[PDB]
Amino acid sequence: RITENIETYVTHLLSDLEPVPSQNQHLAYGYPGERQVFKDPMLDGKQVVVVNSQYDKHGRPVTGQPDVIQEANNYIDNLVAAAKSLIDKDKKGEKDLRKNAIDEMAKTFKKSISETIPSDKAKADLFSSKKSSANKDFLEQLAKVEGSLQQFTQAVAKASGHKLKALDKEGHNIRSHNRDTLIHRFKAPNSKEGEEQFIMYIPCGRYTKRQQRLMGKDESEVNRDHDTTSHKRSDLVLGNSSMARMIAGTRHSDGTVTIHHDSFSGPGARMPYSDFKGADDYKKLAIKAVTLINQEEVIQTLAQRQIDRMTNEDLWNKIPEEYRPDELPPDAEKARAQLIKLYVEHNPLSVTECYTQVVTAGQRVAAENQKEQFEYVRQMMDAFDGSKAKITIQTGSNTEVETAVGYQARMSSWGVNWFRQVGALNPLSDNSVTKNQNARFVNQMTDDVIRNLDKVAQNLGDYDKAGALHTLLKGPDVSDLNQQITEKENALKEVKGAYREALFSYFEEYQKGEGKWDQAKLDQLKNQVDGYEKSIKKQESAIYELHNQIDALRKAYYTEHKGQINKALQELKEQISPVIQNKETDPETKSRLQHFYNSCAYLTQAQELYYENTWHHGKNNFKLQTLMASLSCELDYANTKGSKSNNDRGQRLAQKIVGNALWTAMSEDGLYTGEFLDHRRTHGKEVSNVEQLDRELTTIQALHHTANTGVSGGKFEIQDKANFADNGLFGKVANFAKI
Ligand SMILES: [Hg+2]
Ligand SMILES: [Hg+2]
Ligand SMILES: [Hg+2]
Numbered sequence: 235r236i237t238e239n240i241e242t243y244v245t246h247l248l249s250d251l252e253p254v255p256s257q258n259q260h261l262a263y264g265y266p267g268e269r270q271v272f273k274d275p276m277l278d279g280k281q282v283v284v285v286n287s288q289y290d291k292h293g294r295p296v297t298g299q300p301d302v303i304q305e306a307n308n309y310i311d312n313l314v315a316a317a318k319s320l321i322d323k324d325k326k327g328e329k330d331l332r333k334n335a336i337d338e339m340a341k342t343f344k345k346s347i348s349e350t351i352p353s354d355k356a357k358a359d360l361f362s363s364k365k366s367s368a369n370k371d372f373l374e375q376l377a378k379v380e381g382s383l384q385q386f387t388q389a390v391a392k393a394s395g396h397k398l399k400a401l402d403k404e405g406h407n408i409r410s411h412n413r414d415t416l417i418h419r420f421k422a423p424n425s426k427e428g429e430e431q432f433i434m435y436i437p438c439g440r441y442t443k444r445q446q447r448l449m450g451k452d453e454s455e456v457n458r459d460h461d462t463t464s465h466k467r468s469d470l471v472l473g474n475s476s477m478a479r480m481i482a483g484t485r486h487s488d489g490t491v492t493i494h495h496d497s498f499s500g501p502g503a504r505m506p507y508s509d510f511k512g513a514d515d516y517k518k519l520a521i522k523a524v525t526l527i528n529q530e531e532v533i534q535t536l537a538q539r540q541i542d543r544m545t546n547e548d549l550w551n552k553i554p555e556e557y558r559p560d561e562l563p564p565d566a567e568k569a570r571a572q573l574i575k576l577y578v579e580h581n582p583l584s585v586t587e588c589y590t591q592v593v594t595a596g597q598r599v600a601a602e603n604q605k606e607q608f609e610y611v612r613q614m615m616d617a618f619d620g621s622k623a624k625i626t627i628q629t630g631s632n633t634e635v636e637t638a639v640g641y642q643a644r645m646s647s648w649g650v651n652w653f654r655q656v657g658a659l660n661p662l663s664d665n666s667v668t669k670n671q672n673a674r675f676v677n678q679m680t681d682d683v684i685r686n687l688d689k690v691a692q693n694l695g696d697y698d699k700a701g702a703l704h705t706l707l708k709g710p711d712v713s714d715l716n717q718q719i720t721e722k723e724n725a726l727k728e729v730k731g732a733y734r735e736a737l738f739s740y741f742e743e744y745q746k747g748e749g750k751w752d753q754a755k756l757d758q759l760k761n762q763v764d765g766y767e768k769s770i771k772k773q774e775s776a777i778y779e780l781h782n783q784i785d786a787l788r789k790a791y792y793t794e795h796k797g798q799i800n801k802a803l804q805e806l807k808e809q810i811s812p813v814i815q816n817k818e819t820d821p822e823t824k825s826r827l828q829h830f831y832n833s834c835a836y837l838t839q840a841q842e843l844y845y846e847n848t849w850h851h852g853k854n855n856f857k858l859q860t861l862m863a864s865l866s867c868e869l870d871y872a873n874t875k876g877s878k879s880n881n882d883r884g885q886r887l888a889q890k891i892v893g894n895a896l897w898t899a900m901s902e903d904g905l906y907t908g909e910f911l912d913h914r915r916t917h918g919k920e921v922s923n924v925e926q927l928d929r930e931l932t933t934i935q936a937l938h939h940t941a942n943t944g945v946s947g948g949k950f951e952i953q954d955k956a957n958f959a960d961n962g963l964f965g966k967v968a969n970f971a972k973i
Contacts, residue, residue: 235438235479235535236276237570237628240542244481245491246275247282247415248432254281260412262311263940264304268297274415283941285933287420292919293926298933300358302372302379305945305967306347309383310340312944316405317394326395335393343386350382351375360960361917361929369963376966384973405944407462410475413437416937419485420930422896423923428487431900433892433934435478435499440538442531443626444738445472448745456634458626468745469509469517470524474531476880476942477501479539482892484899495895496543497863497873499888499938502880503603504528504611510603516744519760522610523741526734529614534625536585536872537639541574541627549573552581571630578627584640588866589615589874590859592883594649596664602878605667608647612671615643616774617730620723644682644866646675648849648859650883652953655850670778673785676844679862680788681716682869683837684708690830697827699806703834706799710791712784719780726773733766792845799838806831811903828904829868835906836865852954857911860890864906867895881939881968882950886958889931897927914956921959928959936964943971 236243251272260281263269268288274280288296317336321329355371362369391398415436422431439460443453449465449472451458460473477500483493505525509517546569550558553576562569595608622638629635649655653663684707691704740759743752810827813819840861843849849858863873875891877883890911897910913924921929932948939947947968952958 235436235440235538235542235628237574237630238276238542239545239570240479240481240496240539241491241493241545243276243436243542244434244483244493245489247417247434248419248485248489248491249275251275251282251284260414261315261409261941262308262944263937264308265301269937271414279412280415282415282417283937284417284419285937287418287930287933294359294361295929298930298936299360300372300936300946300963300967302356302375302967303347303351303353305970306351306379306383307344308940309945309970310343310386312405312409313387313390313401314340315408316401317390317396319408320396320400320404321394324395332393332395336390339386339389339393343382347379347382351379358963360932360963362961363917364961364963369961372963373966380970380973383970387973406942409941409944410439410460411462413439413478414941416478416934416941418930418934418937422900422930423926424900425484430485431482431896432485433480433482433931435480435934435938437478438498438535438538439473439477440531440534440626440628441473442527442534444527445531448472448527448741456628456632468747469506470520470745471506472524472527474501474504474528477535477874478938480888480892482896492899494899495867495892497867497891498875500876500880500884501528501532501874502876502884503607503878504532504614504876505606507603507607507878510606516756516760519737519763520741520744521606522613523737523744525610526614526617526737527741529611529618530623530625532587532874533585533618533623533639533641536587537583537625537627537637539872540583540585541577544577546570546573549577552577554580567630571633574627574629575633575635578629578635578637582640583637584642586642586869586871587615587644587874588863588871589643589645589876590863590866590887591645591647592650592856592859592875592877592887593647594651594653594663595647596667597649597651597653597662598664599653599662604878607878608668608671612645612647615645617734617770619643619730620727621731644675644678644871646672646859646862648672650856650859650886650950650953652951654953670782672844674778674781675862676840677781677784677788679865680709680837680841683833683865686833686869690826694826694830697806697809699802699809700830703799703802703806706795706802707834707837710787712787715780715784719777722773722777722780726770729766729770729773733763733770736762736766789845792841796842803831803835803838806834807903807905811905814903814905824904832898832904832906833865833868835908836861836868839908840865853914853956855953855957856887856890859887860894860911863887863891864894867891879942881942882948885935885938885948886950889928889935889958893927893931897924915959917955917959917961925959932960932964939964939968943968945970947971 254271254273259271263283268285270284272282274282285297290296314336318333321332355375358369358372417434419430419432441458446453446458451464477498480497480499482495483491485491505521509521557576557580593604593607595605597604618641622640625639627635647668655665656663687704691700740763743756743759810831814824814827840858843854843858848854863875866873875884875887894910898906910924915925935948936946945967947964949965949968952962
């Protein structure tokens with residue numbers, strides 16, 4: 235990342251920026267005047283797309299609304315760029331003749347769309363019924379345009395000499411080569427005078443040194459942005475995708491920023507899922523290695539984030555007095571650089587990932603390898619847990635350093651789609667695939683909270699009601715079974731280390747190919763890896779075995795103390811709020827109470843959904859996932875969240891988390907009440923403040939989708955309409971990216 239502190243970088247992103255003329259954009263976004271494009275305030279050749287909410291005379295948004303003309307234009311233009319890229323790099327002649335013919339067909343398709351789709355029927359309203367006459371008119375235009383788009387795209391394939399698949403591939407290719415920052419600004423319900431809220435996606439791509447060499451490039455380059463053009467196209471490809479830093483907060487009238495949320499959208503599936511088709515056990519193990527390789531990239535990017543969450547004073551405070559230079563250089567940038575190098579050099583770095591996955595692992599129809607997406611990622615996160623990864627930290631624009639970073643994994647996987655929790659004996663999904671890991675994960679998180687309790691609550695007994703919650707939340711004594719688990723988890727470390735290095739070696743060989751193979755060493759390498767994995771699986775089973783015991787006891791404990799736990803939570807609020815709102819109470823004191831309560835509230839509400847097994851009911855659809863992500867963000871972990879491509883399910887999770895973080899941060903209190911999750915959206919002409927905030931959240935999603943696919947979207951199939959303000963119509967536009 236730019237090695238500037240993230241708060242200052244966000245500050246600048248919300249500045250007066252330089253506009254970018256259409257012909258210089260990296261991508262067509264359409265909706266002119268709404269989706270405004272600008273130069274990045276800090277990085278040369280980087281761009282920013284910003285949307286400001288506008289509203290109609292009724293207070294209903296006019297921005298973030300699907301318009302099929304605009305989407306038709308987006309699709310035409312984005313496919314034309316893929317086409318011209320393919321024809322430029324191809325062997326066949328008559329390049330210009332073909333490119334100009336493509337242009338010519340794009341002009342003709344745009345004009346014909348505009349003569350055939352009336353504007354008064356081209357736009358949808360998200361916040362109304364899909365069955366309104368006006369929305370039925372939008373659907374009808376959409377089906378028309380879809381028809382024109384298959385014609386246009388057929389004609390493009392014919393003219394360009396490339397197939398549908400290759401055009402699509404090249405499309406994803408050039409878009410993720412120069413990704414834009416995306417910003418949505420709006421005043422949330424009850425915003426203060428001259429203040430505004432915001433949500434941004436800032437792309438994160440750094441390539442570990444291991445990825446740089448394997449992707450054909452060379453290790454020595456400090457700047458290691460995502461690049462497939464210098465790659466040699468063996469089927470496997472390295473690097474995470476659809477990953478962005480997600481920041482939400484408020485902007486004060488003076489232009490300063492309070493950050494209310496800071497996590498990752500994505501990454502997507504952490505392996506190359508398409509490679510799965512027709513794969514032998516050799517190609518499968520190789521896929522598992524790509525996932526490992528990708529996991530160290532995640533580790534690298536979490537450490538980079540820790541750094542950018544630190545001010546210069548923070549780094550200074552953390553360099554022992556005797557290593558500090560007498561003089562810090564005049565150049566503000568060369569000072570941060572030195573500050574980062576000294577910090578890293580003198581401090582063990584450790585990072586914790588909380589990955590809330592929202593695929594349905596057990597699904598047996600339209601599976602799309604959701605099983606390996608759970609399994610390979612949980613494997614590889616754990617292969618790294620409680621050890622150290624060699625990594626690179628960018629310190630300046632042409633400087634960097636190498637450190638080990640301590641890593642710690644927490645992974646959970648609760649589905650969100652129609653197959654999330656099938657009935658007894660239903661063969662459409664196997665609900666049991668994630669049972670063990672989710673148990674393990676709930677124990678891990680609830681122990682993390684206990685340890686936090688023993689640490690903080692010990693020293694803040696001015697607040698009696700906080701003591702009593704602590705006692706209750708300690709749960710059943712499970713110290714023995716936990717000891718057993720940490721003993722067996724320590725035993726695994728050396729095998730995991732052997733496993734990781736052996737797998738890495740396996741991919742170096744396999745990545746050569748037929749005319750290049752040395753079969754004897756391949757087979758040898760496969761074999762060592764398998765033995766290590768057999769043995770790891772074996773110990774993983776006894777560890778789960780122990781977790782399931784703790785789970786059993788925790789439940790019994792919960793089912794019987796639920797009432798007291800809530801009473802005790804209520805009573806902490808009741809004593810805690812009026813201190814928080816006292817204007818004489820200092821900021822750091824306020825933080826502490828808020829964190830202590832919010833943390834406990836998240837945990838307990840998660841417990842109810844998990845222990846009563848209600849997380850999967852329609853009315854509770856993303857709540858448990860949101861509650862754990864939220865909790866992990868309180869415990870100051872990096873929360874990664876995902877579906878397969880992260881355009882659909884993972885975006886709806888991000889909406890529920892960002893929207894909650896925004897709702898909560900803007901309370902009198904800053905204390906979580908759950909209204910933003912519990913409130914039943916009604917889609918009416920008059921809605922609540924929570925629903926009004928909800929209306930806002932699909933816009934960054936349409937932008938994000940456009941940047942991934944060429945077209946707006948999110949096509950998540952809503953399970954309970956009362957969970958979301960919008961009616962899913964961006965989903966029908968999202969279908970343009972299939973055709
Ligand atoms: Hg990233
Ligand atoms: Hg707590
Ligand atoms: Hg948080």
